[PDB]
Amino acid sequence: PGTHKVYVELQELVMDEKNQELRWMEAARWVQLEENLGENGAWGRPHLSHLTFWSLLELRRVFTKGTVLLDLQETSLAGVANQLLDRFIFEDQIRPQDREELLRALLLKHSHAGELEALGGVKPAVLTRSGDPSQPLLPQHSSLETQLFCEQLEKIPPDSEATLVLVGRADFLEQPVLGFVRLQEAAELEAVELPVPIRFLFVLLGPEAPHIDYTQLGRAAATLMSERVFRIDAYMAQSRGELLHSLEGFLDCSLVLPPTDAPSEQALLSLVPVQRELLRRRYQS
Amino acid sequence: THKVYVELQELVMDEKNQELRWMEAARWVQLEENLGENGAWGRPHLSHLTFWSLLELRRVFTKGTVLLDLQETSLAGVANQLLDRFIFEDQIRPQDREELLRALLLKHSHAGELEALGGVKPAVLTRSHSSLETQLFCEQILEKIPPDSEATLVLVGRADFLEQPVLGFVRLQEAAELEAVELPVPIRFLFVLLGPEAPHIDYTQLGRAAATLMSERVFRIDAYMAQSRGELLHSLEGFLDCSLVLPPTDAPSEQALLSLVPVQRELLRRRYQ
């Protein structure tokens, strides 16, 4: 009752091919393991969530100055978006001119995998000063997980609550912004098709910047939400400082594996004690 | 192109005489080997890195002091030019120059001499917990080094009088066999990481990150043909692009690490092409 297991969904602002109207569509989901959604429309193989260094860099940077709304007494996604944008303006995260377009982007239709066969496809999109969507200026890199696992719901616990992670690109925004919202009571939103109530909202919006991949940033946020210690801390957090402390503990026990010319598959096994001790340090203090 | 042998040395004190000196801490030939207490080299292992180590390595490399094709054959001249360029780039004050020169010119001890010293303890420079790798690999060379190999020396120290952490990257015009520091192969690259006590900075981890960076073939080639600090920075950004982070997870360790094999093989496909 105090804490629940968390199902995480990552959704990205994308362009559909048939009508060229930008819409929210899920890209990956976390039920104790990450499943990615390919271009064909079938979920890939579940796998352990590996994070890039830059994604964790940017997650820490946007979380340090991030906006958090804890125990927010609201039930609808529109009201939550209104409150988050008001707190964004209060914290100088966004300018008041950005509010109308950010709101109009937040209540777009949240689609799922079932619409991929109906629609022509999905393409990455960037939201402009007006309502028009654009083609991203920075070079496009295909998703690594899509290239690895994609190309070829009964596991959800009954008392689990959902977490929605929304990543979007907006060229008119001055800097990337983080929005973390914990609802006072878990509420069923139209954003998630599943009958799992929503407790947490992750909103990561920003302009195109070097070393910032918003898909990878959303993956890092979702992996952090799927971590047991951070999940408990987010449930019990009463301020942004507790979330930041949990994130520092998360990064202290993260294992960074640098490039090496010879992947032997046996020198990798030499880091089993390292992984065990890092998990011990994460679980103890 | 040359094969590398990286050597990490740290500023320490000896119990018997309380004298500051540079002590062997780890070496890189093909995998990382750490020196623990009692003077026994640990098991060879993959050079895993911490998030904060690579963080601060990038931070101090961005403001790094880079000397390339330096025409010196002794450690004293390299140190003199390095602190002169430190003063020129305003990394350190001119008053700390004498003390830093005194520190960089202390005796460089090695594995064989550790037992005769009656122990070695970590030290911090004044102006006047055990390592994870030791805990997990050390509780229990010339043949391996290729003939046409050149060595890298990573010098790591703590100096409270310094205001900020300072990185100095020196590349020699010709490989030199320094008399002060004895190595099986001549020194070419010289990493100098100094600074005060600061949050999220473990200087052992900074030196390990620098040594792992220098052991990487692509960065080694780039530093061989680098002509400015920007090229080194770009190679470091590519290194971090290919860097993979494993978050703390409850999966079984063997399967958890084996899942990273295809991710690594894809992540390094165009790096070595």
Curated annotation (Swiss-Prot), chain A:
Query: In this chain, where does the modification Phosphoserine occur?
Result: 134
Which parts of the sequence are annotated with region: Interaction with ANK1? 125-134
Locations listed in the record = Cell membrane; Basolateral cell membrane
Cite the effect that the entry attributes to residue 96 to S: In SPH4; Mondego
Consequence of substituting residue 221 to D: In SPH4; Boston
Where is the stretch described as Globular? 4-226
Q: Please tell me, according to the UniProt entry, what happens when changing residue 263 to R.
A: In SPH4; Tuscaloosa
- Enumerate the Cytoplasmic topological stretches: 1-285
The ranges of region (Dimerization arm) come to 240-285
Spell out the post-translational modification annotation for this entry.
Answer: N-glycosylated.
Q: Which family does it belong to?
A: Belongs to the anion exchanger (TC 2.A.31) family.
Q: Which disease is it linked to?
A: Ovalocytosis, Southeast Asian: An autosomal dominant hematologic disorder characterized by ovalocytic erythrocytes that are rigid and exhibit reduced expression of many erythrocyte antigens. Clinical manifestations include mild hemolysis, intermittent jaundice and gallstones. However, the disorder is most often asymptomatic. Spherocytosis 4: An autosomal dominant form of spherocytosis, a group of hematologic disorders characterized by the presence of numerous abnormally shaped erythrocytes which are generally spheroidal. Affected individuals have anemia, jaundice, and splenomegaly. Clinical severity is variable. Some individuals are asymptomatic, whereas others have severe hemolytic anemia requiring erythrocyte transfusion.
Please explain the role this protein plays, according to its UniProt record: Functions both as a transporter that mediates electroneutral anion exchange across the cell membrane and as a structural protein. Component of the ankyrin-1 complex of the erythrocyte membrane; required for normal flexibility and stability of the erythrocyte membrane and for normal erythrocyte shape via the interactions of its cytoplasmic domain with cytoskeletal proteins, glycolytic enzymes, and hemoglobin. Functions as a transporter that mediates the 1:1 exchange of inorganic anions across the erythrocyte membrane.
The subunit structure is: A dimer in solution, but in its membrane environment, it exists primarily as a mixture of dimers and tetramers and spans the membrane asymmetrically. Component of the ankyrin-1 complex in the erythrocyte, composed of ANK1, RHCE, RHAG, SLC4A1, EPB42, GYPA, GYPB and AQP1. Interacts with STOM; this interaction positively regulates SLC4A1 activity. Interacts with GYPA; a GYPA monomer is bound at each end of the SLC4A1 dimer forming a heterotetramer. Three SLC4A1 dimers (Band 3-I, Band 3-II and Band 3-III) participates in the ankyrin-1 complex.
Q: What is this protein called?
A: Band 3 anion transport protein
Organism expressing this protein natively: Homo sapiens (Human)
Swiss-Prot record, chain B:
Q: What is the effect of changing residue 37 to K?
A: In SPH4; Cape Town
Q: Where is this region: Interaction with ANK1?
A: 123-128
User: Which stretches does the entry tag as region Globular?
Assistant: 2-215
Effect noted on mutating residue 94 to S = In SPH4; Mondego
Please report any disulfide bonds recorded for this protein chain, giving both cysteine positions. Answer: none
Quick one: where's region Dimerization arm? 229-273
Q: What does the entry state regarding organ or tissue expression?
A: Detected in erythrocytes (at protein level).
* Compartment(s) of residence: Cell membrane; Basolateral cell membrane
- Top-rank taxon of the source lineage equals Eukaryota
Substitution effect: residue 208 to A/E/S: Impairs expression at the cell membrane
Q: Which residues lie on this side of the membrane: Cytoplasmic?
A: 1-273
Q: How is it modified after translation?
A: N-glycosylated.
Protein task? Functions both as a transporter that mediates electroneutral anion exchange across the cell membrane and as a structural protein. Component of the ankyrin-1 complex of the erythrocyte membrane; required for normal flexibility and stability of the erythrocyte membrane and for normal erythrocyte shape via the interactions of its cytoplasmic domain with cytoskeletal proteins, glycolytic enzymes, and hemoglobin. Functions as a transporter that mediates the 1:1 exchange of inorganic anions across the erythrocyte membrane. (Microbial infection) Acts as a receptor for P.falciparum (isolate 3D7) MSP9 and thus, facilitates merozoite invasion of erythrocytes. Acts as a receptor for P.falciparum (isolate 3D7) MSP1 and thus, facilitates merozoite invasion of erythrocytes.
Q: Which family does it belong to?
A: Belongs to the anion exchanger (TC 2.A.31) family.
Q: Which clinical disorder is mentioned? A: Ovalocytosis, Southeast Asian: An autosomal dominant hematologic disorder characterized by ovalocytic erythrocytes that are rigid and exhibit reduced expression of many erythrocyte antigens. Clinical manifestations include mild hemolysis, intermittent jaundice and gallstones. However, the disorder is most often asymptomatic.
Q: How does it assemble?
A: A dimer in solution, but in its membrane environment, it exists primarily as a mixture of dimers and tetramers and spans the membrane asymmetrically. Component of the ankyrin-1 complex in the erythrocyte, composed of ANK1, RHCE, RHAG, SLC4A1, EPB42, GYPA, GYPB and AQP1. Interacts with STOM; this interaction positively regulates SLC4A1 activity. Interacts with GYPA; a GYPA monomer is bound at each end of the SLC4A1 dimer forming a heterotetramer. Three SLC4A1 dimers (Band 3-I, Band 3-II and Band 3-III) participates in the ankyrin-1 complex.
Specify the protein name: Band 3 anion transport protein
Gene for this chain: SLC4A1
Within the intact protein, the region shown is 54 to 348 of 911
